[PDB]
Every structure is written in structure tokens, then in C-alpha cells.
Design an enzyme around this catalytic site. Structure first.
Site, mmCIF file in Angstrom:
data_model
loop_
_atom_site.group_PDB
_atom_site.id
_atom_site.type_symbol
_atom_site.label_atom_id
_atom_site.label_comp_id
_atom_site.label_asym_id
_atom_site.label_seq_id
_atom_site.Cartn_x
_atom_site.Cartn_y
_atom_site.Cartn_z
ATOM 1 C CB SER A 29 -0.927 0.021 1.221
ATOM 2 O OG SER A 29 -2.213 -0.484 0.907
ATOM 3 N N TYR A 30 2.154 7.005 -2.881
ATOM 4 C CA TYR A 30 2.464 6.804 -4.297
ATOM 5 C C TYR A 30 1.454 5.894 -5.021
ATOM 6 N N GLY A 31 1.168 4.719 -4.447
ATOM 7 C CA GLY A 31 0.128 3.808 -4.968
ATOM 8 C C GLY A 31 0.160 2.410 -4.361
ATOM 9 C CG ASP A 163 13.490 5.755 -9.411
ATOM 10 O OD1 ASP A 163 13.525 6.875 -9.975
ATOM 11 O OD2 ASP A 163 13.774 5.620 -8.185
HETATM 12 N N1 HIZ Z 1 6.108 1.074 -6.075
HETATM 13 C C1 HIZ Z 1 5.846 0.505 -7.399
HETATM 14 C C2 HIZ Z 1 5.524 -1.002 -7.269
HETATM 15 O O1 HIZ Z 1 5.781 -1.813 -8.467
HETATM 16 C C3 HIZ Z 1 4.580 -1.992 -9.260
HETATM 17 C C4 HIZ Z 1 4.510 -1.516 -10.563
HETATM 18 C C5 HIZ Z 1 3.488 -1.966 -11.399
HETATM 19 C C6 HIZ Z 1 3.427 -1.477 -12.702
HETATM 20 C C7 HIZ Z 1 4.373 -0.555 -13.170
HETATM 21 C C8 HIZ Z 1 5.397 -0.105 -12.335
HETATM 22 C C9 HIZ Z 1 5.455 -0.595 -11.032
HETATM 23 C C10 HIZ Z 1 7.061 0.760 -8.315
HETATM 24 C C11 HIZ Z 1 8.200 0.030 -8.235
HETATM 25 S S1 HIZ Z 1 9.251 0.638 -9.420
HETATM 26 C C12 HIZ Z 1 8.129 1.819 -10.001
HETATM 27 N N2 HIZ Z 1 8.319 2.753 -10.950
HETATM 28 C C13 HIZ Z 1 9.525 2.970 -11.495
HETATM 29 O O2 HIZ Z 1 10.485 2.272 -11.181
HETATM 30 N N3 HIZ Z 1 9.649 3.934 -12.414
HETATM 31 C C14 HIZ Z 1 10.832 4.245 -12.984
HETATM 32 C C15 HIZ Z 1 11.156 5.603 -13.026
HETATM 33 C C16 HIZ Z 1 12.373 6.034 -13.560
HETATM 34 C C17 HIZ Z 1 13.297 5.114 -14.057
HETATM 35 F F1 HIZ Z 1 14.491 5.507 -14.589
HETATM 36 C C18 HIZ Z 1 12.987 3.761 -14.005
HETATM 37 CL CL1 HIZ Z 1 14.167 2.663 -14.627
HETATM 38 C C19 HIZ Z 1 11.768 3.318 -13.468
HETATM 39 N N4 HIZ Z 1 7.022 1.739 -9.251
#
Ligand code: HIZ
Ligand code: BOG
Length: 334
Positions: A29, A30-31, A163
Site C-alpha cells: 500500500s 504513491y500507490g 525506481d
Molecule cells: N512502487 C511501485 C511497485 O511496483 C509496481 C509496478 C506496477 C506497474 C508498473 C510499475 C510498477 C514501483 C516500483 S518501481 C516503479 N516505478 C519505477 O520504477 N519507475 C521508474 C522511473 C524512472 C526510471 F528511470 C525507471 Cl528505470 C523506473 N514503481
């Protein structure tokens, strides 16, 4: 056409997802996030429902940046988007954004657990980090927060850069000091720190606070030389560096006792105080350490990424409409 959706209460809200995503099981549980099984592809997936994406200009701006970034990233060693959906049928009923990616049930700490890895294992893991970095850097993007928790790895040690943003242990010294013109080699510093730890089984610079961190770094890399001092704009920074007791850079061979000399050599080229002098990701991939992995014909580069679009000062309904267009325009990968 439009998939048939089903509704389910999860994470204190009613989630509404395509039938293809089955067995939703909350994993945070950002999102908020649930693990699911994608019956269309046969993959285990992570489905993220964004929290309050259009609550403020800032949240709207972040949602758009996050979506655009993930849609752009198309590389084996970087997180990408399997799907993006909204239950909305129009811009006017649009409020919720869900992002779908490969379910990654472990990060680098989960797989490594403070133990020494073998040299061959280190070559493979670092190779992959640098292959993903080459691609990220070619888009003109700096990660800025590379650490074990931002690296997803499956039990077969296949790795993706993520990230999610001790949290300071992998940060380049210039970042610790709030310099404001970072180059891409801040990420290469982080890679050196990760690589050292994988080889030795121990954190390279485990600082107890901000200033201790800088102290540990300088102990290894030496106090700044004349060339580096010449590049320091801040008069206070200058004055401070000039009043230090000049320590020589330690010899990395007497720090990384036992290691492959090729590994020690790479680490010397990564952990240089002067950011301008650190090896780049492309150069590192060509380093002899990676002979068993390097393939110049399959280390691809990204299309250029426009970061000025997310750096606008727009109204909420403008960011929301722009995010909506991005949702509707998504094309799933092959
Ligand atoms: N907390 C969520 C949980 O995971 C679920 C989920 C589900 C679907 C899509 C994404 C995440 C999460 C973990 S990692 C992330 N987003 C990025 O890492 N963005 C990103 C930004 C800049 C960059 F340079 C890179 Cl390489 C990556 N969000
Ligand atoms: C206390 C001494 C800390 C070491 C100083 C950090 C040196 C980092 O290197 C510096 O990176 C800057 C940021 O991109 C560049 O603008 C400079 O050209 C580069 O020398």
C-alpha cells in the site's frame, strides 16, 4: 474491443480490472500494488493502482512523468510496461490509472543476502546493470538513486533496473553535497559501490550519517587533487578542501584482497572522485572484465526522451487530459 472489467475490494478501495488479470493479492500500500496472474500472457504480474494521481498539479505532473517514462523504457534490463488501463470510457469519467509490469518478487538484497558472490556471478549481474544503464543514459536520463533495492532480480539472476522512489550508501559524493550539475557517472559511482559489495560481502561505504559517509569515501578515494579543486565553484567548498590533510587514494588491490585483477581495475575506473573521470556505461561494457558477456550488437540504445514535457507548469485538467491521451495511445509490447 474494450475488455470486460470486474470490480473487487482490495487495499481499502474498489479495484476495477480486465478479466485477464486474475487472483489479485495485495503486496503493498504513491500507490497500492497487487500481484496477479495474467491469463492472456501466462505471466505473474504486478498491478499498481495509482493513489491520488490527479489530486494536485504536482500529483498530476508526477503521474504523467511516471507513465511517459515507463512507456518509453523498452529494454531487457530496465522495468517496462506490460499494460496500462483505466476503467473509464471517456475523459470525463477518468480518475484512476493502473500500471502493469512483470511481477518481480525479489531485489538484489533478497538474492544476495550479505554473502560473497562468485566472480562469475558478479560479472553477469554488473554486466546487466551496465547494459540497462547504457540504454537509460542514451535517452539522456540519470537514474540518481541506483541501489540494491532498486534492482529486481529473478531466481535465475536476470536483472531489471527499477525506481521505487543506508539509503545513502550508494550515492555519489557530489549528490551528498547537493552539487547542482550532475553527470550520468553519478550512476557509475553507484554501480562501483554495488559491485564492491557483491564481491566482498560487505557495504563499501556504510556511513552512519551524512558526514560520516563523505569521510568513508575520502578514506578510499583520497582527498581531491589540484585538477579537481580547480573545478569547484563554491568558495566555501574550496576553503574547506584546502584546509584538509591530504591523504593518498588507497590502493584498491589492498582493499579487495583476492579479487580478479580485472574487477579491481574496473572498480578503480568507477570510483574516481572526479565525476568527469569515471568510466561511462558504454566504456565499461567494453572492459575486459565482461569478455564472456559483452556483445556490441545487442547492447541497444534508446530513442531520445523529452523531459521538458513533464517540466511544464500546467493546470490539473491539462495534465489529466495529457495522461489520458497516453493511456489511450499505449501499445503493448510483442
Ligand atoms: N512502487 C511501485 C511497485 O511496483 C509496481 C509496478 C506496477 C506497474 C508498473 C510499475 C510498477 C514501483 C516500483 S518501481 C516503479 N516505478 C519505477 O520504477 N519507475 C521508474 C522511473 C524512472 C526510471 F528511470 C525507471 Cl528505470 C523506473 N514503481
Ligand atoms: C569533498 C570533496 C567531494 C568531491 C567533489 C565531487 C567531485 C565530482 O566531480 C565533479 O562532478 C561535478 C558534478 O557533475 C562536475 O560539474 C565536475 O566537473 C566534476 O569534477
Amino acid at each position: 474491443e474494450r475488455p470486460t472489467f470486474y470490480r473487487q475490494e482490495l487495499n481499502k478501495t474498489i479495484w476495477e480490472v480486465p478479466e485477464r488479470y486474475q487472483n489479485l493479492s495485495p503486496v503493498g500500500s504513491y500507490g497500492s500494488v497487487c500481484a496477479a496472474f495474467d491469463t492472456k500472457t501466462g505471466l505473474r504480474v504486478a498491478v499498481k493502482k495509482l493513489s491520488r494521481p490527479f489530486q494536485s498539479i504536482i500529483h498530476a505532473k508526477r503521474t504523467y512523468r511516471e507513465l511517459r517514462l515507463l512507456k518509453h523504457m523498452k529494454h531487457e534490463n530496465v522495468i517496462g510496461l506490460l499494460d496500462v488501463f483505466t476503467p473509464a470510457r471517456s475523459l470525463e469519467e477518468f480518475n484512476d490509472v493502473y500500471l502493469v509490469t512483470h511481477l518481480m518478487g525479489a531485489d538484489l538484497n533478497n538474492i544476495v543476502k550479505s554473502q560473497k558472490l562468485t566472480d562469475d556471478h558478479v560479472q553477469f549481474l554488473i554486466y546487466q546493470i551496465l547494459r540497462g544503464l547504457k540504454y537509460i543514459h542514451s535517452a539522456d536520463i540519470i537514474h540518481r538513486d541506483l541501489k540494491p533495492s532498486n534492482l529486481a532480480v529473478n531466481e535465475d539472476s536476470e536483472l531489471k533496473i527499477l525506481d521505487f522512489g543506508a539509503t545513502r550508501w550508494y550515492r555519489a559524493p557530489e549528490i551528498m553535497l547537493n552539487w547542482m550539475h550532475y553527470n550520468q557517472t553519478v550512476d557509475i559511482w553507484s554501480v562501483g559501490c554495488i559491485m564492491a559489495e557483491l564481491l566482498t560481502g560487505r557495504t563499501l561505504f556504510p556511513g552512519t550519517d551524512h558526514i560520516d559517509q563523505l569521510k568513508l569515501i575520502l578514506r578510499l578515494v583520497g582527498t581531491p587533487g589540484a585538477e579537481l579543486l580547480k573545478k569547484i565553484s563554491s568558495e566555501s567548498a574550496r576553503n574547506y578542501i584546502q584546509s584538509l590533510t591530504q591523504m593518498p587514494k588507497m590502493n584498491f588491490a589492498n582493499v579487495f584482497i583476492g579479487a580478479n585483477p580485472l574487477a579491481v581495475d574496473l572498480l578503480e575506473k568507477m570510483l574516481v572522485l572526479d565525476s568527469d573521470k569515471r568510466i561511462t556505461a558504454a566504456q565499461a561494457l567494453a572492459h575486459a572484465y565482461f569478455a564472456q558477456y559483452h556483445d556490441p550488437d545487442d547492447e541497444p540504445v534508446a530513442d531520445p526522451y523529452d523531459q521538458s514535457l513533464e517540466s511544464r507548469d500546467l493546470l490539473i485538467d491539462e495534465w489529466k487530459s495529457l495522461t489520458y491521451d497516453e493511456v489511450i495511445s499505449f501499445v503493448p509490447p510483442p
